[PDB]
Design a protein around this ligand. Structure first.
Ligand SMILES: OC[C@H]1O[C@H](O)[C@H](O)[C@@H](O)[C@@H]1O
Ligand SMILES: OC[C@H]1O[C@H](O)[C@H](O)[C@@H](O)[C@@H]1O
Lengths: 453, 456
């Protein structure tokens, strides 16, 4: 049972708690070929049949590149203190390496100015998956040179925006950019090769480290973070095999990123099984990867239930999907189970020395539209109540949970799922570009408005 | 293999050549304005190419081309078949023309002229500018129009000197091998993408023919196809219907539109709903008349019916080899499949003059004694040229023959491991060594053109 009474729920949060809404550049911007933007690997992935539902693409999206003032006005009306957004590398350095696109920088310059004027805090993500297509020539993330391209891109953005940005994250979800994109073939560039994935793994960890150094060198005032979909790993049974399975799944899906960044090492059992196939790790890599961060971002939606897979010749971590425990599912099919969020954060703060935590993404897919000038999305409202409940519990128990960004300000391009899957607090009619604040959004606004106190 | 007796089986004006492709030999992948091709991306992402081999070095031809031309001249080979790198000419696919790129081929073509070497250029031999992948590569119709402009750009500069041009080399590879089987760049395995690539390459061929004739009307225009010699596993009804389905899919998909102005009926029945839009004028554009056509032949395609539930058209599976002779890449040697193939094609379609634009064999032996003993290559050539001479005697319009690899080179997904050259290349020293097969081929080709002399 949720609870949902906002006035009560609001009492459970400290006065300086940060409430936000989140978007990503490719998902909402459109204007793919204007002001010097060159193609990203997602433009390619969309336009090649077989990868994205309906062959949907980012050409128009929410037209946010043009309508951004309205959107910031909306965040202002909702009384949301913070906006988490991503910056398009294809706009800043269209070829990945090469000339800087001054018009690219100009746009986010204005965007940040726009937020500053409205008293909206800025949480920027440098990389939320739109890698300049040209970088695939050298091998993309499988090439170490791509990390150096990112390095220069980060130093460029932070030099321009560092005097106003409230916070910066290097990467959004290495798990997706790494395994889902290079091992499972589901996200761009759509590869299914362990050697390629391991290369991407290390080079993205490396690029993060280069990114930290770059930010601090040109904008040392801005708190630097990293955003991770750490998976709440839950065994199917308490059998010895399933417990061991959950630990391996943890090392592979979480440790591959958390241990290098926060412990300056890769997980030992993972190295045993997969080490021989990694690219060169240079003497100074791990110490660069493991620089101290001022904050970190957690993205969470649903647990990762695993069982052992004893199949002959199963690759590490040799696990398979266990069935859902809750009956409740979102429209995209993900199990709804709030307490996995609690145990996830506990495990992480026991296992790693972590800085302040912001819940950088939390939300649900529910595809109801506009009937009677209102969007009736009670199951989404329920979701936020139930999960914010857990976040308040974490605050009570002493964890340094400093903020929460509701995932998806508005409906947008949902990657492989195209425009089919809505995650927004605000409905978008893609034929008129009209924004309609959903009922869940009215609720979240009623909660967020009372902060700061 | 007596080369004198074999030489006599050919007409005096028969054309002997050696063949090459831009990405396989050139190197200099980042020089003079060249942007990446889909094959640079393909090579450099682990899992696609043996050893992760790439085209960066290759045979360093971009730097050593005059020496390689002198080599062709010294061999006595009259013709040179090569491809032009689109990534050097219009590096983003669309976008600004790169003059440095054009100059290189301009100077190459001048070098062929000065040496008396006839030029048979291939506009597209698989090196698509990576940027075009932004719109969906060959799955986007726009890519055909980019080619069209590329085609026109090249022929405007080179058309006053080129002896001949082919639009595309092997639609089958660029279409099915690249978009359905995932073996070649860009490495897709999707029928919808492959069908889009199929029509868009056919269409691009047509645009190319018109573009070339618009700016260089005198230049003979062709298309190079690895037409598959489809042989059934048995004469069973199921196997023979399968061979015909296979012919339609692997050959008909390209031969029918180009030479009959229609797609194969049964194939349209199984797959047409998943094809891209065929605009009103498309098929007439595709089926413009050609002055010649190139056949690439290596080995037969033996097939059997596959009754597996839901097996997609053409619903066939590989059948086993009849000969037990195989090249080092694993391809059956079976020369008579060349004869039956050519005769099938000429009965089935109305075709212009034929050149064998590729024929050769993978054998990986290297330099020992300062010499390369590649008898199986030589044996392969003598036997296949015999077949070509049989086709001549039977009255088939066989005008010329190009040996498959002037030199060992980057062999696509196989990297540098699989050698096809008449000339051995040591990739550390870049030293060219003429193999024994090369000596033999030079001996044969040197007698042509036979020239005006008496008889008795
Ligand atoms: O549904 C997935 C949503 O959460 C993901 O973790 C991504 O960070 C976000 O872009 C996406 O839309
Ligand atoms: O092995 C295949 C060889 O034949 C194919 O016909 C190609 O056109 C050539 O580039 C390749 O090297």
């Amino acid at each position: 049972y949720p609870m949902t009474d906002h006035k009560a729920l609001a009492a459970r949060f400290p006065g300086d708690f940060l409430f936000g809404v989140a978007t990503a550049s490719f998902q909402i911007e459109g204007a793919t070929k204007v002001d010097g933007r060159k193609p990203s690997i997602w433009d390619a992935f969309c336009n090649m049949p077989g990868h994205v539902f309906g062959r949907h693409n980012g050409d128009v999206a929410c037209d946010h590149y043009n309508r951004w003032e309205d959107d910031l006005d909306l965040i202002k009306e909702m009384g949301v203190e913070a906006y988490r957004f991503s910056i398009a590398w294809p706009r800043i350095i269209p070829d990945g390496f090469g000339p800087i696109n001054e018009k690219g920088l100009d746009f986010y310059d204005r965007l940040v100015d726009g937020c500053k004027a409205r008293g909206i805090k800025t949480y920027a993500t440098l990389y939320h998956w739109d890698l300049p297509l040209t970088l695939m020539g050298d091998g993309g993330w499988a090439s170490r040179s791509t990390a150096h391209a990112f390095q220069r891109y980060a130093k460029t953005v932070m030099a321009r925006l560092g005097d106003r940005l409230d916070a910066v994250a290097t990467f959004n979800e290495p798990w997706c950019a790494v395994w889902l994109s290079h091992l499972y073939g589901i996200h761009a560039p759509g590869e299914r090769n362990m050697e390629a994935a391991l290369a991407a793994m290390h080079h993205i960890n490396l690029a993060h480290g280069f990114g930290v150094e770059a930010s601090r060198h040109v904008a040392p005032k801005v708190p630097v973070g990293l955003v991770l979909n750490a998976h709440s790993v839950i065994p199917a049974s308490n059998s010895d095999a399933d417990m061991k399975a959950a630990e391996r799944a943890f090392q592979f899906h979480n440790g591959a990123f958390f241990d290098p960044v926060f412990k300056g090492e890769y997980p030992a059992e993972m190295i045993e099984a997969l080490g021989s196939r990694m690219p060169v790790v240079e003497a100074e890599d791990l110490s660069i990867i493991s620089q101290k961060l001022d904050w970190w971002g957690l993205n969470y939606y649903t647990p990762m239930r695993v069982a052992d897979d004893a199949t002959e010749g199963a690759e590490f971590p040799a696990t398979k999907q266990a069935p859902a425990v809750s009956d409740v599912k979102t429209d995209i099919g993900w199990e709804v189970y709030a307490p996995a969020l609690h145990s996830l954060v506990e495990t992480l703060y026991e296992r790693y020395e972590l800085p302040d935590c912001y819940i950088t993404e939390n939300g649900a897919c529910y595809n109801m539209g506009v009937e009677n000038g209102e969007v009736d999305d009670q199951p989404r409202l329920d979701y936020y109540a139930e999960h914010l409940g857990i976040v308040a519990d974490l605050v009570k128990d002493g964890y340094p949970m400093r903020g929460y960004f509701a995932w998806s300000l508005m409906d947008n391009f949902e990657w492989a799922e195209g425009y089919r899957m809505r995650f927004g607090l605000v409905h978008v009619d893609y034929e008129t570009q009209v924004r309609t604040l959903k009922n869940s959004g009215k609720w979240y606004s009623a909660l967020a408005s009372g902060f700061p106190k």
